[PDB]
Design an enzyme around this catalytic site. Structure first.
Site, PDB file in Angstrom:
ATOM      1  N   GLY A  34      66.013  20.346  -1.222  1.00  0.00           N
ATOM      2  CA  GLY A  34      65.906  20.957   0.036  1.00  0.00           C
ATOM      3  C   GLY A  34      66.301  22.504  -0.364  1.00  0.00           C
TER       4      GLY A  34
ATOM      5  CG  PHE B  32      71.044  29.101  -2.691  1.00  0.00           C
ATOM      6  CD1 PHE B  32      71.516  30.086  -3.257  1.00  0.00           C
ATOM      7  CD2 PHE B  32      70.731  27.890  -3.493  1.00  0.00           C
ATOM      8  CE1 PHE B  32      71.992  30.123  -4.828  1.00  0.00           C
ATOM      9  CE2 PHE B  32      71.251  27.997  -4.793  1.00  0.00           C
ATOM     10  CZ  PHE B  32      71.918  29.004  -5.293  1.00  0.00           C
ATOM     11  N   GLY B  33      67.832  29.819  -2.159  1.00  0.00           N
ATOM     12  CA  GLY B  33      66.353  30.077  -2.817  1.00  0.00           C
ATOM     13  C   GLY B  33      65.830  28.747  -3.403  1.00  0.00           C
ATOM     14  CE  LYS B  34      60.390  27.094  -3.477  1.00  0.00           C
ATOM     15  NZ  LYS B  34      59.957  25.674  -2.980  1.00  0.00           N
ATOM     16  CB  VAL B  35      67.786  24.449  -6.051  1.00  0.00           C
ATOM     17  CG1 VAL B  35      68.749  23.651  -6.869  1.00  0.00           C
ATOM     18  CG2 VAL B  35      68.636  25.401  -5.534  1.00  0.00           C
TER      19      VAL B  35
ATOM     20  CG  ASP C   9      80.686  33.142   0.897  1.00  0.00           C
ATOM     21  OD1 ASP C   9      81.130  33.276   2.138  1.00  0.00           O
ATOM     22  OD2 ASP C   9      79.691  32.664   0.977  1.00  0.00           O
TER      23      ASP C   9
HETATM   24  C1  LIG Z   1      76.832  35.859  -8.827  1.00  0.00           C
HETATM   25  C2  LIG Z   1      77.739  34.504  -8.758  1.00  0.00           C
HETATM   26  C3  LIG Z   1      78.312  34.373  -9.987  1.00  0.00           C
HETATM   27  C4  LIG Z   1      79.000  33.199  -9.733  1.00  0.00           C
HETATM   28  C5  LIG Z   1      78.738  32.106  -9.047  1.00  0.00           C
HETATM   29  N1  LIG Z   1      79.420  30.904  -9.134  1.00  0.00           N
HETATM   30  N2  LIG Z   1      80.973  30.793  -9.199  1.00  0.00           N
HETATM   31  C6  LIG Z   1      81.404  29.413  -8.979  1.00  0.00           C
HETATM   32  C7  LIG Z   1      82.807  29.185  -9.421  1.00  0.00           C
HETATM   33  C8  LIG Z   1      83.731  30.480  -8.827  1.00  0.00           C
HETATM   34  C9  LIG Z   1      83.142  27.817  -8.439  1.00  0.00           C
HETATM   35  C10 LIG Z   1      83.164  28.987 -10.805  1.00  0.00           C
HETATM   36  C11 LIG Z   1      80.181  28.626  -9.104  1.00  0.00           C
HETATM   37  C12 LIG Z   1      79.075  29.656  -8.985  1.00  0.00           C
HETATM   38  N3  LIG Z   1      77.785  29.113  -8.878  1.00  0.00           N
HETATM   39  C13 LIG Z   1      77.240  28.074  -8.274  1.00  0.00           C
HETATM   40  O1  LIG Z   1      77.806  27.035  -8.025  1.00  0.00           O
HETATM   41  N4  LIG Z   1      75.999  28.162  -7.865  1.00  0.00           N
HETATM   42  C14 LIG Z   1      75.164  26.901  -7.609  1.00  0.00           C
HETATM   43  C15 LIG Z   1      75.296  26.775  -6.028  1.00  0.00           C
HETATM   44  C16 LIG Z   1      74.659  25.567  -5.809  1.00  0.00           C
HETATM   45  C17 LIG Z   1      73.369  24.907  -6.551  1.00  0.00           C
HETATM   46  O2  LIG Z   1      72.651  23.685  -6.322  1.00  0.00           O
HETATM   47  C18 LIG Z   1      72.731  23.120  -4.898  1.00  0.00           C
HETATM   48  C19 LIG Z   1      73.582  21.629  -5.075  1.00  0.00           C
HETATM   49  N5  LIG Z   1      72.892  21.022  -5.988  1.00  0.00           N
HETATM   50  C20 LIG Z   1      72.884  19.822  -5.407  1.00  0.00           C
HETATM   51  C21 LIG Z   1      73.786  18.669  -5.410  1.00  0.00           C
HETATM   52  O3  LIG Z   1      74.473  18.608  -6.633  1.00  0.00           O
HETATM   53  C22 LIG Z   1      74.847  19.692  -7.169  1.00  0.00           C
HETATM   54  C23 LIG Z   1      73.628  20.848  -7.053  1.00  0.00           C
HETATM   55  C24 LIG Z   1      73.396  25.129  -7.914  1.00  0.00           C
HETATM   56  C25 LIG Z   1      72.622  24.703  -8.977  1.00  0.00           C
HETATM   57  C26 LIG Z   1      72.460  25.225 -10.167  1.00  0.00           C
HETATM   58  C27 LIG Z   1      73.138  26.194 -10.548  1.00  0.00           C
HETATM   59  C28 LIG Z   1      74.060  26.905  -9.708  1.00  0.00           C
HETATM   60  C29 LIG Z   1      74.189  26.441  -8.383  1.00  0.00           C
HETATM   61  C30 LIG Z   1      77.727  32.325  -7.959  1.00  0.00           C
HETATM   62  C31 LIG Z   1      77.334  33.489  -7.842  1.00  0.00           C
END
Ligand SMILES: Cc1ccc(-n2nc(C(C)(C)C)cc2NC(=O)Nc2ccc(OCCN3CCOCC3)c3ccccc23)cc1
EC number: 2.7.11.1
Length: 282
Positions: A28, A32-35, A142
């Site tokens: 989905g 956010f973008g392309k996952v 956030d």
């Molecule tokens: C600039 C920046 C720097 C750091 C972050 N950042 N900081 C954190 C902490 C603070 C919690 C450690 C976590 C994150 N980044 C994330 O948690 N990013 C993500 C969100 C949702 C996602 O996928 C959607 C959900 N998906 C399906 C269900 O199962 C899980 C994966 C993702 C899929 C692949 C890779 C990253 C994802 C973010 C931005």
């Protein structure tokens, strides 16, 4: 000196991800973008993968910050890095798949908010993670229900998909660093607990134009129906939702609060994810 195409510590540019990872589908999206969902070639381990079209080597250096943060935050209640690859002109980030779903999506499908014991577990675990994040001098910035992902096992995984109903008053009011930036998460945590109790956040019903104003000038929000909730919960919100960042308590200080200080079992959240799981198909 000047450096071209540095070798980053958790990135491999010498290997196709499609050697290791099979793309099973689209997970989905929002804005956010392309996952993508992906399977391991050796183990069959499920994972989520996002891909970014980096034009330059200057861009790449920006986007890898997320990887550096993800790698350094190894904790039971935080999404867990599996690896990163830079192949072709595309940066790949991957983390362990989370089949429970975001806490807000759970609330949507049941058309109801969380019970208090459900909120207690989320709260205690979110607190354990924030205490660790602040341990590393890392601020989330956030916090909301949509960034609380779930496993089937009962435990949260804290995420961040990088309108402001959860913004702290000192941040609303700011016009320009400070020694109490870490405290902004604690305000947001409090607003997240109300969101979990009442489905939507405070001031949901307002014109978004008015929301920053409302937060700046209003007394801290309270539960719409206090009688439905414990005294420990109301008191927790009262000291968490303090408009003065200096007197607002740390993540550690709240862990000692009687609303979370005796929570050992994750059971109520095991039970929650199962109900949601059972109603996926019917
Ligand atoms: C600039 C920046 C720097 C750091 C972050 N950042 N900081 C954190 C902490 C603070 C919690 C450690 C976590 C994150 N980044 C994330 O948690 N990013 C993500 C969100 C949702 C996602 O996928 C959607 C959900 N998906 C399906 C269900 O199962 C899980 C994966 C993702 C899929 C692949 C890779 C990253 C994802 C973010 C931005």
């Amino acid at each position: 000196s000047m450096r071209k195409s540095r070798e980053y510590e958790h990135v491999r540019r010498d290997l196709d991800p499609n050697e290791v990872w099979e793309i099973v589908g689209e997970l989905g999206d929002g804005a956010f973008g392309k996952v993508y969902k992906a399977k391991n070639k050796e183990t069959g381990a499920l994972a989520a993968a996002k891909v970014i079209e980096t034009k330059s080597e200057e861009e790449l250096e920006d986007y890898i910050v997320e990887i550096e943060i993800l790698a350094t935050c190894d904790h039971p209640y935080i999404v867990k890095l599996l690896g990163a690859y830079y192949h072709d002109g595309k940066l790949w980030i991957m983390i362990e798949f989370c089949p429970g779903g975001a806490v807000d999506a759970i609330m949507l499908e049941l058309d109801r908010g969380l019970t208090e014991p459900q909120i207690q577990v989320v709260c205690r675990q979110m607190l354990e993670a924030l205490n660790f994040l602040h341990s590393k001098r890392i601020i989330h910035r956030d916090l909301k229900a949509g960034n609380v992902l779930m496993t089937l096992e009962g435990d949260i995984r804290l995420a961040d998909f990088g309108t402001p109903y959860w913004m702290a008053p000192e941040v609303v009011m700011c016009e320009t660093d400070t020694p109490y930036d870490y405290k902004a998460d604690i305000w947001s945590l409090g607003i997240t607990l109300i969101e979990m109790a009442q489905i939507e956040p405070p001031h949901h019903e307002l014109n978004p134009m008015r929301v920053l104003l409302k937060i700046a000038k209003s007394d801290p929000p309270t539960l719409l129906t206090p009688s439905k909730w414990s005294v420990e919960f109301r008191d927790f919100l009262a000291i968490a939702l303090d408009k003065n960042p200096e007197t607002r308590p740390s993540a550690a200080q709240l862990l000692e609060h009687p609303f979370v200080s005796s929570i050992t079992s994750n059971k109520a959240l095991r039970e929650l994810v199962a109900e949601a799981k059972a109603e996926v198909m019917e």
